[PDB]
Enzyme design. Structure first.
Site, PDB file in Angstrom:
ATOM      1  N   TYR A  39      -0.258  10.263   4.640  1.00 19.47           N
ATOM      2  CA  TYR A  39      -0.849   9.381   3.641  1.00 19.47           C
ATOM      3  C   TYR A  39      -1.945  10.108   2.864  1.00 19.47           C
ATOM      4  O   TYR A  39      -2.810  10.755   3.472  1.00 19.47           O
ATOM      5  CB  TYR A  39      -1.398   8.110   4.297  1.00 19.47           C
ATOM      6  CG  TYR A  39      -1.635   6.975   3.342  1.00 19.47           C
ATOM      7  CD1 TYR A  39      -0.585   6.477   2.590  1.00 19.47           C
ATOM      8  CD2 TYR A  39      -2.890   6.370   3.217  1.00 19.47           C
ATOM      9  CE1 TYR A  39      -0.759   5.444   1.717  1.00 19.47           C
ATOM     10  CE2 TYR A  39      -3.070   5.299   2.328  1.00 19.47           C
ATOM     11  CZ  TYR A  39      -1.985   4.858   1.587  1.00 19.47           C
ATOM     12  OH  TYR A  39      -2.075   3.810   0.690  1.00 19.47           O
ATOM     13  N   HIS A  40      -1.865   9.998   1.527  1.00 21.07           N
ATOM     14  CA  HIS A  40      -2.793  10.615   0.556  1.00 21.07           C
ATOM     15  C   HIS A  40      -2.610  12.132   0.328  1.00 21.07           C
ATOM     16  O   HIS A  40      -3.515  12.817  -0.129  1.00 21.07           O
ATOM     17  CB  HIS A  40      -4.273  10.239   0.850  1.00 21.07           C
ATOM     18  CG  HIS A  40      -4.590   8.799   0.591  1.00 21.07           C
ATOM     19  ND1 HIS A  40      -5.615   8.132   1.230  1.00 21.07           N
ATOM     20  CD2 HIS A  40      -4.001   7.888  -0.228  1.00 21.07           C
ATOM     21  CE1 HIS A  40      -5.648   6.876   0.812  1.00 21.07           C
ATOM     22  NE2 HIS A  40      -4.687   6.704  -0.080  1.00 21.07           N
ATOM     23  N   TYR A  95      -2.221   0.972  -7.243  1.00 24.85           N
ATOM     24  CA  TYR A  95      -0.947   1.414  -6.593  1.00 24.85           C
ATOM     25  C   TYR A  95       0.312   1.131  -7.418  1.00 24.85           C
ATOM     26  O   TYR A  95       1.424   1.295  -6.918  1.00 24.85           O
ATOM     27  CB  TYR A  95      -0.778   0.835  -5.173  1.00 24.85           C
ATOM     28  CG  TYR A  95      -1.652   1.488  -4.108  1.00 24.85           C
ATOM     29  CD1 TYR A  95      -2.855   2.144  -4.445  1.00 24.85           C
ATOM     30  CD2 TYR A  95      -1.286   1.410  -2.758  1.00 24.85           C
ATOM     31  CE1 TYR A  95      -3.694   2.739  -3.431  1.00 24.85           C
ATOM     32  CE2 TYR A  95      -2.069   1.988  -1.762  1.00 24.85           C
ATOM     33  CZ  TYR A  95      -3.274   2.648  -2.109  1.00 24.85           C
ATOM     34  OH  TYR A  95      -4.040   3.225  -1.100  1.00 24.85           O
ATOM     35  N   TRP A 116      -2.366  -3.516  -5.152  1.00 28.52           N
ATOM     36  CA  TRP A 116      -3.421  -2.951  -4.256  1.00 28.52           C
ATOM     37  C   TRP A 116      -4.849  -3.360  -4.680  1.00 28.52           C
ATOM     38  O   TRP A 116      -5.728  -3.572  -3.827  1.00 28.52           O
ATOM     39  CB  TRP A 116      -3.343  -1.422  -4.107  1.00 28.52           C
ATOM     40  CG  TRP A 116      -4.326  -0.849  -3.105  1.00 28.52           C
ATOM     41  CD1 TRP A 116      -4.171  -0.764  -1.741  1.00 28.52           C
ATOM     42  CD2 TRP A 116      -5.601  -0.256  -3.399  1.00 28.52           C
ATOM     43  NE1 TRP A 116      -5.279  -0.151  -1.172  1.00 28.52           N
ATOM     44  CE2 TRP A 116      -6.175   0.149  -2.168  1.00 28.52           C
ATOM     45  CE3 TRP A 116      -6.327  -0.044  -4.591  1.00 28.52           C
ATOM     46  CZ2 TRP A 116      -7.430   0.760  -2.091  1.00 28.52           C
ATOM     47  CZ3 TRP A 116      -7.572   0.580  -4.514  1.00 28.52           C
ATOM     48  CH2 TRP A 116      -8.109   0.968  -3.266  1.00 28.52           C
ATOM     49  N   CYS A 118      -6.313   5.548  -6.203  1.00 35.49           N
ATOM     50  CA  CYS A 118      -5.184   4.604  -6.185  1.00 35.49           C
ATOM     51  C   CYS A 118      -4.650   4.198  -7.560  1.00 35.49           C
ATOM     52  O   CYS A 118      -4.400   3.020  -7.797  1.00 35.49           O
ATOM     53  CB  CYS A 118      -5.551   3.343  -5.391  1.00 35.49           C
ATOM     54  SG  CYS A 118      -5.161   3.473  -3.641  1.00 35.49           S
ATOM     55  N   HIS A 173       0.022   9.296  -3.947  1.00 41.76           N
ATOM     56  CA  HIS A 173       0.664   8.266  -3.139  1.00 41.76           C
ATOM     57  C   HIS A 173       2.196   8.322  -3.164  1.00 41.76           C
ATOM     58  O   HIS A 173       2.838   7.269  -3.108  1.00 41.76           O
ATOM     59  CB  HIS A 173       0.204   6.876  -3.585  1.00 41.76           C
ATOM     60  CG  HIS A 173      -1.219   6.573  -3.231  1.00 41.76           C
ATOM     61  ND1 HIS A 173      -2.288   7.141  -3.891  1.00 41.76           N
ATOM     62  CD2 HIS A 173      -1.747   5.769  -2.284  1.00 41.76           C
ATOM     63  CE1 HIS A 173      -3.414   6.707  -3.354  1.00 41.76           C
ATOM     64  NE2 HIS A 173      -3.114   5.866  -2.380  1.00 41.76           N
TER      65      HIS A 173
END
Ligand SMILES: [Ca+2]
Length: 639
Positions: A495-496, A272, A290, A228, A581
Site C-alpha cells: 500500500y502506497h 481516491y 475516500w 490520495c 494507489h
C-alpha cells in the site's frame, strides 16, 4: 518510523576510519552501542572542514550486506544531520564501484536507513555529501550494517534490481517531469504521515536520473495537501492533481517552469478517484469517496483552456461501483480509466462491469459488458492494475487486485481487453494462465517493447502492513501470451507504492507505508533494469542512438523522421506516466510502423486518432535487432 530489511551485524571486531574526528567525538563513538555518544567532524579549534565527510568500516570478514542505519545525535542539537549521501561497498577497501544507495535523508533526529539488495562485502562506506541544514559538519550517534541470512547471485537473463534511491519522504504519489526527465514525488502534509493533516500543504521531493540529486519542496501556493488524489497529464503539458486530503482542490504542475499553479476547484469533493486525460486534452474524473463525503459522485470534466471543472451528472458512477464490503467509501475508488476515441473514457474495472463514459453534453454511461473469459466472470478486482500496452490495437492488460479494498485475498486473474469503437462491448479473454503470484497494491508499467512489468504487492490486502509480500516481479510478453518471473527484490512495496517508466527504459519503483510511527514506511525507491539492457555477457548492452529528430512536437497524424547510429528493427511511443494507489491513467504504448529511408534514416506517422495518441508528452524509443532500446527522445503530441 522505518526498518532495516536485514539483521544487525556484530561490530565487536570492526575497524572504522573517518575523514576527521573531534577529540571526545572519535570515529569509533559511532559503533560503541551508546546513543548518547556520537562521532563529530572537526569544529571550532580544528577548523570547520566542509562536507563531503566519510565514514568507512572494515568488518574484517565478508558479509551478505543488505543495508545500513544511521542514528543522528540525540542531544537536541541538529549539527551534522546527514543530508545528501551515498553508500559504497567493497571487497578490498580500495575499489568502491558505484553507490548501492544514494539520495537525501530528511532533516530530523530519527534513525535513517539505506536498504538495498544483498551484496557480499567486507568494507562499507557512508559518504555524507551535505549536512541537512547546509552546515559544515557531520555527526553520527550509531551506525549499523545489516545482513541477509543468505546470498544468491541474480539469475542471468532476468533483469537486475539496484541501486536504491534514499528519500526524505515516502513517495506515495509520483510523476515523471517530461521536460526535465526528473521523477517528481509527494507524500502529504508530513514526510511520513497524512493523518491529522490541517490541509493546505504538500511535501514533495524530486530525483534527477542525470545527476542523482534528490531535492525537496514544500508546496503551499495551491492550498492543497495532495495525498490520495486523482492525477492526469493534460493536453497542455500540465499535471492535474485533484482532491484527496483537500477534497475539492486542483493543483497544476507545469514541467517547463518547474512550478505549481493553482487550478479551479472541482465541482465535487473527491479522494481516491481516478482521472483520465481525454482525446481533446481535457481531464475526466468520476467516483472518489475516500474524501469530501461518501455519496454518488458522478463525472466531471476539466478544461485546460477555460480553466473550469464542469459537472457531468449523467456520466453516472452507479454502473462502475464494486460490491465492496465497506460500501461506497471504497466501491467508487481507483477506476481503471483510459481516454479513448471522440472524448470517451473506457472504464475496464475494478468492477466486474466494464463501462463506456461519454463526455458530450451532461455526460452518459453505457454498459460495455463484464470482464470475463472461458474461465468465468472476473470478480471485482479493487487495486488490480490495468495497462494499455498497444493503444493502436486497443489492447489493455488487467491483473491482480482483490474483491474488497482490504482484508481480502488478492487473485492471479489477468485479462486482455480489446477496445474497438466506443459503445461496443470489447472482447475479453484470459491472459495466459494468469499471474505467477496473487497480488494487490502492486504497480506496473508498459516497457518500450510492449511487455508489462508488474511488481510488489501482497497476497492479502492489509494497508500499512508489510505482510504476505510478493518479492518476485513478473513481465507479461504479449507476442508470447506468457508471463515471466524476474529477479526478486528485497524491499516490500505494498500500500502506497508506485512504479514509473524512466526515460532510460528502466523502472523506478518506490514508496509504501505513510503511517507515521509505523515501522512500515519506506523512504526510498529502487531501479529495475530489464533484461533488454543486458548483453548475453551480463554486461550492459550497447544501445542504439537517436542521432536526429525532424521535430520535438507533432500533431496527431503527423510524420517524424529520425536518424540512428545503427539499424532499427522496431520503435514505440510511450506516453509519460503518473502514479498513485496503483493507478496510472497516463501511460500507454503505440507501436510505430517504420518506413526505412535507407542509411539509418526512418520515418513514422503518429496515429491520426487522438483517442489513441492521447495529447501530451511521449517517449520515443527505438530498438536494434538485438532488442536493445535507445534512451527516450521526448516528443510532444498535440491535436
Ligand atoms: Ca555512540
Amino acid at each position: 518510523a522505518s526498518a532495516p530489511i536485514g539483521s544487525a551485524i556484530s561490530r565487536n571486531n570492526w575497524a572504522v576510519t573517518c575523514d576527521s574526528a573531534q577529540s571526545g567525538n572519535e570515529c569509533n563513538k559511532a559503533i560503541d552501542g551508546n546513543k548518547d555518544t556520537f562521532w563529530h567532524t572537526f569544529y571550532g579549534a580544528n577548523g570547520d572542514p566542509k562536507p563531503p565527510h566519510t565514514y568507512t568500516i572494515d568488518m574484517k570478514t565478508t558479509q551478505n550486506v543488505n543495508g545500513l542505519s544511521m542514528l543522528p545525535r540525540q542531544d537536541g542539537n541538529q549539527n551534522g544531520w546527514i543530508g545528501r549521501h551515498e553508500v559504497y561497498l567493497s571487497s578490498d577497501g580500495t575499489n568502491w564501484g558505484s553507490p548501492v544507495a544514494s539520495g537525501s535523508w530528511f532533516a530530523d533526529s530519527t534513525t535513517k536507513y539505506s536498504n538495498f539488495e544483498t551484496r557480499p562485502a567486507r568494507y562499507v562506506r557512508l559518504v555524507a555529501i551535505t549536512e541537512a541544514n547546509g552546515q559544515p559538519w557531520t555527526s553520527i550517534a550509531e551506525i549499523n550494517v545489516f545482513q541477509a541470512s543468505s546470498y544468491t547471485a541474480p539469475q542471468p537473463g532476468l533483469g537486475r534490481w539496484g541501486p536504491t534511491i534514499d528519500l526524505p519522504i515516502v513517495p506515495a504519489a509520483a510523476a515523471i517531469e517530461p521536460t526535465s526527465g526528473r521523477v517528481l514525488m509527494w507524500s502529504s502534509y508530513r514526510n511520513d504521515a497524512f493523518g491529522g493533516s490541517p490541509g493546505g500543504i504538500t511535501l514533495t521531493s524530486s530525483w534527477d536520473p542525470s545527476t542523482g540529486i534528490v531535492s525537496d519542496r514544500t508546496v503551499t501556493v495551491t492550498k492543497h495537501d495532495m495525498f490520495c488524489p486523482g492525477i492526469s497529464m493534460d493536453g497542455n503539458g500540465q499535471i492535474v492533481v485533484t482532491g484527496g486530503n483537500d477534497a475539492k482542490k486542483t493543483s497544476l504542475y507545469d514541467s517547463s517552469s518547474d512550478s505549481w499553479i493553482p487550478g479551479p476547484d472541482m465541482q465535487v469533493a473527491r479522494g481516491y478517484q481516478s482521472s483520465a486525460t481525454m482525446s481533446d486534452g481535457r481531464v475526466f474524473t468520476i467516483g472518489g469517496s475516500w474524501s469530501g463525503g461518501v455519496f454518488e459522485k458522478n463525472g466531471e470534466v476539466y478544461s485546460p483552456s477555460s480553466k473550469t471543472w464542469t459537472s457531468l451528472p449523467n456520466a453516472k458512477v452507479n454502473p462502475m461501483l464494486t460490491a465492496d464490503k465497506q460500501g461506497l467509501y471504497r466501491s467508487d475508488n481507483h477506476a481503471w480509466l483510459f481516454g479513448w476515441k471522440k472524448g470517451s473514457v473506457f472504464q475496464a474495472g475494478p468492477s466486474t462491469a466494464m463501462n463506456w463514459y461519454y463526455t458530450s453534453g451532461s455526460g452518459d454511461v453505457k454498459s460495455a459488458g463484464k470482464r470475463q473469459s472461458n474461465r468465468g466472470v472476473a470478480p471485482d478486482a479493487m487495486c488490480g492494475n490495468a495497462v494499455m500496452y498497444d493503444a493502436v490495437k486497443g489492447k489493455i492488460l488487467t491483473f491482480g487486485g482483490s474483491p474488497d479494498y482490504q482484508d481480502s485475498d488478492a487473485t492471479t486473474n489477468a485479462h486482455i481487453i480489446t477496445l474497438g469503437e466506443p459503445g461496443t462491448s470489447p472482447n475479453t479473454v484470459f491472459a495466459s494462465n494468469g499471474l505467477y503470484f496473487a497480488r494487490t497494491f502492486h504497480t506496473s508499467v508498459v516497457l518500450p517493447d510492449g511487455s508489462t512489468f508488474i511488481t510488489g504487492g501482497q497476497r492479502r490486502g492489509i494497508p500499512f502492513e508489510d505482510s504476505t509480500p510478493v518479492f518476485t516481479p513478473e513481465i507479461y510478453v504479449p507476442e508470447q501470451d506468457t508471463f515471466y518471473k524476474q529477479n526478486p527484490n528485497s524491499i516490500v512495496r505494498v500500500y502506497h507504492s508506485i512504479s514509473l517508466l524512466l526515460p532510460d527504459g528502466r523502472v523506478f519503483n518506490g514508496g509504501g507505508g505513510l503511517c507515521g510511527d509505523c515501522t512500515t514506511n519506506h523512504f526510498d525507491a529502487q531501479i529495475f533494469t530489464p533484461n533488454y539492457l543486458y548483453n548475453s555477457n551480463g554486461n550492459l548492452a550497447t544501445r542504439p542512438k537517436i542521432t536526429r529528430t525532424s521535430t520535438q512536437s507533432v500533431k496527431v497524424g503527423g510524420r517524424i523522421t529520425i536518424s540512428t547510429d545503427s539499424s532499427i528493427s522496431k520503435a514505440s511511443l510511450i506516453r509519460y506516466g503518473t502514479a498513485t494507489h496503483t493507478v496510472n491513467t497516463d501511460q500507454r504504448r503505440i507501436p510505430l510502423t517504420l518506413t526505412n529511408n535507407g542509411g539509418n534514416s526512418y520515418s513514422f506517422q503518429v496515429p491520426s486518432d487522438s483517442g489513441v495518441a492521447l495529447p501530451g508528452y511521449w517517449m520515443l524509443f527505438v530498438m536494434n535487432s538485438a532488442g536493445v532500446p535507445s534512451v527516450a527522445s521526448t516528443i510532444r503530441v498535440t491535436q
